């Protein structure tokens, strides 16, 4: 409530009193409709949003969408609130009661445990970081502001400060006119390091050593010890983007790691300063003699602070006074070569290794610790040898992804320009046959005369770009679309052929239905091969897509078929004795695999991860868990824990009888999904003007230029606008209704599974989730505004189903805020502006003093386009998902 | 409470470093200190020494240590429970009271607030006790106790601070605390700029943000000028060079590039930021027609130098494309000062950076005005309008340097010029041959000396630093102050040598007056200069001139002293005024009363009415940055204080002395003077008492700046010496005598102190400071250092002393109607380690003074318990 008298205060003294009116009358109709559910107001709501101007409806869309953002802060505001004046330390005393796991146990399987959090940049982030940033100083101002300690002129200058920062917000434009480049995602992306993953690391790690000592274990966590790591897609992932060069991925590289060398250099020269003891061990003694004898007796003028030759006197100083040499060069360096193509700063002047960085640190660590200081040496130094073992010498190292027919079209370039025949047209056993033997083979491939097309120089160019860089700026190389070891196969090949000194790990990518059910065979198959297994040192990594999986098949089905396969994937790869890390690539939007992160850690089979885990961060999400200091606290706690319980507390395994019920469950699932999004002739039809799906690039999102042949990101994103959510939900109904028919019994036996099968209980949970964000009216609302009059039953079959089904979900679960009124304004303004969109009527360097000539290049009418955004972005904002 | 806490916290730590046997001897001295500063028996005293007698020397060593850091973890604690208290309950209060008791409207307040000036200038007078390399843990440790008086504590929270608390008194405990070699004027000059990228940078436009307040909580709706000099900062810091030949032209050099590239640095750190805000596509004809300009040569390239905003910066966001070019100018000036300080030089083109203090301001004046034009006022008074305070308080170097030089090395340089001319000698020439030549070559064309001029070291040094001032820019300094300045003639020869060294914008010119004969003719000084019309036509009716206060209470009474300077103050006042002259006073205060110190308000109120006039300029000494500027709350306080005590002083104007009171000042200066030169000029064995009873001699030891008969010595030891005692000789000596005569000649005259101390703000103020003086006194000390280390024979000396000191305090009081335990413990420890003075790698701490000409475990011990001493009562000299 306070935000909105703030906000329209705000309001009305930027447009008057009349605009303020019109807003509060749409809160008040919307509020009849979230209230009494009459349809009838829905047209009494339209029927006001048709008189507004062309600005003045632009006005209107910008105001309900920025109360929709103040309402997300509220609400962090108040959780954080609300949780702080009272997990891990749970957690522990849980495993310990009753478990009766030991402490030592829950501190050796901590050691050996590690979550990979790897972001990307899919474009799924739908509010600009020009604005984000007032988003991020609106809730500082809140979170200074719900408390009970503001003296009062400390709150009037908090008051003037958040009314001229939400003045700020509404003042900017928010429809970014162009999309972004992948360097700017990548920005966009590493800007939550150097704000709140930098200094949120080392306080976590305090924390669990908090937590550990609250269980008995004086002992610390390991500085070495990987419990998180950060990875990034951002420049890498160049799967169906061909924006995303090989000269970008190098901008990335060379980003990435002049922002770590700019950090660490920041640190360092307080750390000096802190360092002031005398005692060491005879060890540090000799070292920093060592220094002091190649001392440079110089100006050193080029630093601020400590520029004269650091006495003998304090050795910890001479020690992390090379440290500084080295950073300084280490900066200087990465800043030419990525300013410049080239340095004349010498090698040996930096830090080239990932821990010839940590050698002193470690040193100084050592002597603190024998000399009696290890209370100091657990501080400002620990928290500095975590950031660098966590952070290394650029923040994330970097994974390439790309589809395998690229890599098959190279191939068939090289076997027809050496006469060889066709890579293509030979079969898979020719295709292992024949790269096994160039593998073990020690004769170079092509050659500098090999035709090549755009596509094919892309592909090598990126693999030329991996070989000039560092090893330690990579991660893995992931293949999409995957099937066979010749695909792997193939790219070790490449990557050895374009002279790639230390060849970076393959992993495949199996993300429709039909890859992951015969994944575990060709994974198997793959192991198979002794060259492979020989090289590969015991460890595999596999990526497991969640996007296209449910898209092409039921949600059900596809979830269900996800279990199966990681069970199995681990099931092949105790068979082979490798240790198998699994690459969940999740969504923020359940339909892509989203979720709460514990309950879709608890719903994985038992023994599947084993302290190795890895999840992706898809864009928005970033801003959802590393946006604020509490987000990322619990972000890395909320991982660690779940991951933590679900290697000492395993999930139950089902029971034959669950198994054949969910598979039989599945088919039915999938008949029901594909029998309406696929066998009905006039489905696609039907999307195409139901949801707003058609108009999604227009959010210029991403860098990224059939409905089975679209993709998953808009496929969500268009039944989530209109509040329908047909993906989530759609093969749930016949399933239930077909295993009650079958058998009266399995209705007690559904009441069980849902009461013990966490995989079950969670998937059932989120679909109730989801109801509770959903309104058939709304879709109701849009085929009657935007569906021809013909098969307006048709989305009334899907209604039907709807309420079908969510009567099903409650019954085996054994069941019967106000901002939803916002999103109804907004879906309203949606569903009217798409019809004088679709209208022939409305169809069409100076500067701009008003909204309307903000978009002089829009096909549409001068006020509508804009308006669409605003109802996009609004209403993504209200249901805190996009796609 | 908190002492307690801090207490066995700390004996917890020392335990746990060095056993309970050494943990019990510190409790052991703190109850016998305990019963001395309870009991007061002086029994206790040497039954306090006996104890300390048998401890080993790495134990007395580590004993020193101990009380020293329990003083300075109470300081600490005295610091947050001030901040507490005061938060949960002035400028609101100075406002209110300057509306209802005297009547001034909120303009009137708004009008003189906006022509005010404090100009804090800080100094590297070797007062600064504790090395920054500890000073920095102190700040640590006042952090985690601020942290920890709360009551929003969550478990975890509380035990992790625990941690850090532990772990930081552990690491300022195992560092040493003794600096070994003394700094570099560099060294001083980054220990003193320290305090502007931790506190001051961020702390200014905060303060501004609450002065705004304030005026809209009196009804004024309008903001304080961005440009509107409030508040200002110098420095001395490698400047000045009297008596310091360390400081050197090139050290000159070395800390105006240095500074330049803080400041450079500091504004780049900000600009990327400030863009990030900028986002409004509102904007002026103007800013739209100057963001075209810049857009249209916006050099279409990479620019992969910078992480963010790499491109180019389109139209549509036009604050952003005027801020981004002063990014790029921000850019070139930080990598111009970064190049000319490390080697000497730069390629860069002077174009591409910022040369003019306000070249920088144009392009965000132009942004603030057009957000207010376009409606986003509340937008503009946000980031923009801290950035722009910053600019126009900071500027392109962070502090504007002061350069000081006594007189009569320019005399020297002269002579050498006018021998080398063979015109006679200047030295031998009288007062009116010097002002007539001068003004000649002054008002003449011709070049006065030449390339092959003969010149002495310190005739180079003097002309190399005008030389340095000429190659440098010229906001990158401040005043030139003269030391030992009689006569014109002396401020003429500094005009006269900056013109002929081509210093293209010649720095003003400022008189030092800081003996007392000095103070007495200083208005007729500065009234000659006046006459001087050339000068007077130069100075363009801005004069200021420079009042010291250390030396004045030295060589004379302190009451004389402080008599004669509020007399000299006023006259100087009438003088300018006579001449039209807006005069602005530069008041070299120190820390302690005995050089002028004491609470800032009261220094501002004890000042005679209309002598400020929104113009002041007061010394910041070492010791006083650290106090005054080591933490948000105490920076804040600083300004406040300031900035309330100038405005009050300038509205609610100080009474005006009764002849009555003159006459009656003057003849009690009369005998406070005599009284003082009695004992400590007179009394030809006075400097062998001193140098025995007091450890004077000891004070170079600490090694705290970079400068290498009593009439003869520095007035900051002189503090020091019965400042450590606490017996504060200098302080109260004079009123003895003065006061008693006064009632002696008259006992009426007693009901006229009466009425003085009630009503005479300058009065009150002296004689309460003096009572303060005597709180923090005990004349039991120097009876146990006389006893100790003054041989038999002169014994009773003191005692007179001994006599006077309660006879002064009974009359101070008269017409005004924890800690010393440790405190107590080290000053026997001084004591006794003075006796033992007189008789004839590192792995512990006796091996860590190798050098030492005493005994191993001695001289540390000394220094340890000066250090202690002088926290514990909060000053040094």
């Given at each position: 409530?306070?935000?909105?008298?703030?906000?329209?205060?705000?309001?009305?003294?930027?447009?008057?009193?009349?605009?303020?009116?019109?807003?509060?009358?749409?809160?008040?109709?919307?509020?009849?409709?979230?209230?009494?559910?009459?349809?009838?107001?829905?047209?009494?709501?339209?029927?006001?949003?048709?008189?507004?101007?062309?600005?003045?409806?632009?006005?209107?869309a910008k105001?309900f969408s920025h109360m929709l953002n103040l309402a997300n802060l509220?609400?962090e505001?108040?959780?954080?609130?609300?949780?702080?004046?009272?997990?891990?330390?749970?957690?522990?005393?849980?495993?310990?009661?009753?478990?009766?796991?030991?402490?030592?146990?829950?501190?050796?399987?901590?050691?050996?445990?590690?979550?990979?959090?790897?972001?990307?940049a899919?474009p799924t982030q739908s509010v600009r970081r020009s604005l984000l940033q007032k988003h991020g100083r609106i809730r500082?101002?809140?979170?200074?502001?719900?408390?009970?300690?503001?003296?009062?002129?400390?709150?009037?200058?908090?008051?003037?400060?958040?009314?001229?920062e939400i003045?700020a917000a509404f003042?900017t434009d928010e429809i970014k006119?162009?999309?972004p480049?992948?360097?700017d995602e990548?920005?966009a992306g590493?800007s939550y390091?150097?704000?709140?993953?930098?200094?949120?690391?080392?306080?976590?790690?305090?924390?669990?050593?908090?937590?550990?000592?609250?269980?008995?274990?004086?002992?610390?966590?390991?500085?070495?010890?990987?419990?998180?790591?950060?990875?990034?897609?951002?420049?890498?992932?160049?799967?169906?983007?061909?924006?995303?060069?090989?000269?970008?991925?190098?901008?990335?590289?060379?980003?990435?790691?002049?922002?770590?060398?700019?950090?660490?250099?920041?640190?360092?020269?307080?750390?000096?300063?802190?360092?002031?003891?005398?005692?060491?061990?005879?060890?540090?003694?000799?070292?920093?003699?060592?220094?002091?004898?190649?001392?440079?007796?110089?100006?050193?003028?080029?630093?601020?602070?400590?520029?004269?030759?650091?006495?003998?006197?304090?050795?910890?100083?001479?020690?992390?006074?090379?440290?500084?040499?080295?950073?300084?060069?280490?900066?200087?360096?990465?800043?030419?070569?990525?300013?410049?193509?080239?340095?004349?700063?010498?090698?040996?002047?930096?830090?080239?290794?990932?821990?010839?960085?940590?050698?002193?640190?470690?040193?100084?660590?050592?002597?603190?610790?024998?000399?009696?200081?290890?209370?100091?040496?657990?501080?400002?130094?620990?928290?500095?040898?975590?950031?660098?073992?966590?952070?290394?010498?650029?923040?994330?190292?970097?994974?390439?992804?790309?589809?395998?027919?690229?890599?098959?079209?190279?191939?068939?370039?090289?076997?027809?320009?050496?006469?060889?025949?066709?890579?293509?047209?030979?079969?898979?056993?020719?295709?292992?046959?024949?790269?096994?033997?160039?593998?073990?083979?020690?004769?170079?491939?092509?050659?500098?005369?090999?035709?090549?097309?755009?596509?094919?120089?892309?592909?090598?160019?990126?693999?030329?770009?991996?070989?000039?860089?560092?090893?330690?700026?990579?991660?893995?190389?992931?293949?999409?679309?995957?099937?066979?070891?010749?695909?792997?196969?193939?790219?070790?090949?490449?990557?050895?052929?374009?002279?790639?000194?230390?060849?970076?790990?393959?992993?495949?990518?199996?993300?429709?239905?039909?890859?992951?059910?015969?994944?575990?065979?060709?994974?198997?198959?793959?192991?198979?091969?002794?060259?492979?297994?020989?090289?590969?040192?015991?460890?595999?990594?596999?990526?497991?897509?969640?996007?296209?999986?449910?898209?092409?098949?039921?949600?059900?089905?596809?979830?269900?078929?996800?279990?199966?396969?990681?069970?199995?994937?681990?099931?092949?790869?105790?068979?082979?004795?490798?240790?198998?890390?699994?690459?969940?690539?999740?969504?923020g939007?359940?339909?892509?695999?989203?979720?709460?992160?514990?309950?879709?850690?608890?719903?994985?089979?038992?023994?599947?991860?084993?302290?190795?885990?890895?999840?992706?961060?898809q864009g928005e999400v970033i801003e959802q868990?590393f946006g604020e200091?509490?987000?990322?606290?619990?972000?890395?706690?909320?991982?660690?824990?779940?991951?933590?319980?679900?290697?000492?507390?395993?999930?139950?395994?089902?029971?034959?009888?669950?198994?054949?019920?969910?598979?039989?469950?599945?088919?039915?699932?999938?008949?029901?999904?594909?029998?309406?999004?696929?066998?009905?002739?006039?489905?696609?039809?039907?999307?195409?003007?139901?949801?707003?799906?058609?108009?999604?690039?227009?959010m210029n999102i991403g860098?990224?230029?059939?409905?089975?042949?679209?993709?998953?990101?808009?496929?969500?994103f268009?039944?989530?606008?209109?509040?329908?959510?047909?993906?989530?939900?759609?093969?749930?109904?016949?399933?239930?209704?077909?295993?009650?028919?079958?058998?009266?019994?399995?209705?007690?036996?559904?009441?069980?599974?849902?009461?013990?099968?966490?995989?079950?209980?969670?998937?059932?949970?989120?679909?109730?989730?989801?109801?509770?964000?959903?309104?058939?009216?709304?879709?109701?609302?849009?085929?009657?505004?935007?569906?021809?009059?013909?098969?307006?039953?048709?989305?009334?079959?899907?209604?039907?189903?709807?309420?079908?089904?969510?009567?099903?979900?409650?019954?085996?679960?054994?069941?019967?805020?106000?901002?939803?009124?916002?999103?109804?304004?907004l879906?309203?303004?949606?569903?009217?502006?798409?019809?004088?969109?679709?209208?022939?009527?409305?169809?069409?360097?100076?500067?701009?003093?008003?909204?309307?000539?903000?978009?002089?290049?829009?096909?549409?009418?001068?006020?509508?386009?804009?308006?669409?955004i605003l109802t996009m972005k609004g209403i993504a904002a209200g249901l805190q998902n996009t796609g």
């Amino acid at each position: 409530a306070l935000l909105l008298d703030r906000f329209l205060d705000i309001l009305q003294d930027l447009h008057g009193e009349d605009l303020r009116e019109t807003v509060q009358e749409l809160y008040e109709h919307s509020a009849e409709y979230e209230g009494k559910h009459e349809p009838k107001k829905l047209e009494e709501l339209g029927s006001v949003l048709t008189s507004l101007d062309p600005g003045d409806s632009i006005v209107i869309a910008k105001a309900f969408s920025h109360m929709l953002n103040l309402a997300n802060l509220a609400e962090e505001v108040q959780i954080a609130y609300r949780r702080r004046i009272k997990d891990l330390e749970e957690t522990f005393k849980k495993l310990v009661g009753d478990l009766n796991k030991s402490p030592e146990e829950i501190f050796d399987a901590l050691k050996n445990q590690t979550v990979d959090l790897v972001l990307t940049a899919h474009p799924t982030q739908s509010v600009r970081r020009s604005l984000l940033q007032k988003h991020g100083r609106i809730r500082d101002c809140l979170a200074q502001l719900y408390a009970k300690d503001i003296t009062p002129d400390d709150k009037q200058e908090l008051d003037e400060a958040l009314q001229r920062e939400i003045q700020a917000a509404f003042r900017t434009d928010e429809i970014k006119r162009t999309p972004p480049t992948p360097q700017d995602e990548m920005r966009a992306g590493m800007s939550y390091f150097h704000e709140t993953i930098w200094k949120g690391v080392p306080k976590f790690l305090r924390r669990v050593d908090t937590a550990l000592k609250n269980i008995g274990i004086e002992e610390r966590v390991p500085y070495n010890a990987p419990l998180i790591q950060f990875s990034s897609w951002m420049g890498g992932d160049r799967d169906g983007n061909p924006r995303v060069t090989p000269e970008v991925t190098r901008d990335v590289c060379l980003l990435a790691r002049m922002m770590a060398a700019t950090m660490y250099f920041n640190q360092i020269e307080d750390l000096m300063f802190e360092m002031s003891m005398w005692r060491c061990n005879d060890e540090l003694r000799a070292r920093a003699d060592e220094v002091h004898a190649n001392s440079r007796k110089d100006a050193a003028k080029h630093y601020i602070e400590f520029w004269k030759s650091i006495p003998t006197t304090e050795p910890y100083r001479v020690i992390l006074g090379d440290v500084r040499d080295k950073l300084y060069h280490t900066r200087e360096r990465a800043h030419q070569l990525l300013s410049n193509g080239h340095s004349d700063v010498p090698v040996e002047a930096t830090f080239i290794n990932l821990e010839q960085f940590l050698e002193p640190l470690e040193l100084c660590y050592r002597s603190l610790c024998s000399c009696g200081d290890r209370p100091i040496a657990d501080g400002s130094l620990l928290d500095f040898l975590r950031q660098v073992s966590t952070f290394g010498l650029s923040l994330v190292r970097l994974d390439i992804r790309q589809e395998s027919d690229r890599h098959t079209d190279v191939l068939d370039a090289i076997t027809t320009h050496l006469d060889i025949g066709s890579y293509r047209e030979w079969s898979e056993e020719r295709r292992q046959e024949w790269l096994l033997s160039e593998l073990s083979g020690k004769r170079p491939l092509f050659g500098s005369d090999l035709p090549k097309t755009e596509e094919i120089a892309d592909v090598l160019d990126t693999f030329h770009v991996i070989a000039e860089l560092p090893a330690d700026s990579f991660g893995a190389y992931i293949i999409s679309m995957a099937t066979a070891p010749s695909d792997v196969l193939a790219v070790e090949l490449l990557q050895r052929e374009c002279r790639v000194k230390q060849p970076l790990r393959v992993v495949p990518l199996f993300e429709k239905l039909a890859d992951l059910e015969a994944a575990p065979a060709a994974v198997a198959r793959l192991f198979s091969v002794d060259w492979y297994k020989n090289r590969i040192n015991g460890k595999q990594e596999v990526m497991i897509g969640y996007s296209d999986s449910g898209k092409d098949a039921g949600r059900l089905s596809a979830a269900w078929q996800l279990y199966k396969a990681q069970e199995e994937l681990v099931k092949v790869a105790k068979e082979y004795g490798v240790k198998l890390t699994m690459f969940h690539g999740r969504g923020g939007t359940v339909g892509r695999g989203g979720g709460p992160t514990h309950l879709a850690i608890l719903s994985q089979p038992p023994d599947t991860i084993n302290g190795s885990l890895r999840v992706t961060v898809q864009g928005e999400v970033i801003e959802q868990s590393f946006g604020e200091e509490h987000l990322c606290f619990r972000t890395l706690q909320r991982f660690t824990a779940a991951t933590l319980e679900h290697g000492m507390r395993p999930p139950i395994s089902p029971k034959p009888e669950w198994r054949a019920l969910l598979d039989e469950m599945a088919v039915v699932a999938t008949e029901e999904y594909r029998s309406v999004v696929f066998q009905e002739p006039r489905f696609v039809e039907y999307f195409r003007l139901a949801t707003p799906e058609l108009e999604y690039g227009r959010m210029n999102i991403g860098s990224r230029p059939g409905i089975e042949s679209l993709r998953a990101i808009p496929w969500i994103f268009a039944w989530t606008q209109t509040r329908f959510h047909l993906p989530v939900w759609l093969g749930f109904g016949s399933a239930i209704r077909h295993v009650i028919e079958k058998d009266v019994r399995n209705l007690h036996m559904l009441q069980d599974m849902y009461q013990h099968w966490p995989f079950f209980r969670v998937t059932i949970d989120l679909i109730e989730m989801v109801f509770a964000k959903g309104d058939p009216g709304i879709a109701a609302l849009y085929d009657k505004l935007l569906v021809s009059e013909e098969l307006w039953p048709f989305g009334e079959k899907l209604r039907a189903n709807f309420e079908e089904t969510k009567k099903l979900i409650l019954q085996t679960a054994g069941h019967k805020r106000l901002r939803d009124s916002y999103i109804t304004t907004l879906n309203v303004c949606q569903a009217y502006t798409l019809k004088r969109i679709r209208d022939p009527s409305y169809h069409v360097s100076k500067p701009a003093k008003e909204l309307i000539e903000l978009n002089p290049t829009s096909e549409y009418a001068p006020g509508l386009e804009d308006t669409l955004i605003l109802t996009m972005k609004g209403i993504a904002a209200g249901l805190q998902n996009t796609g």
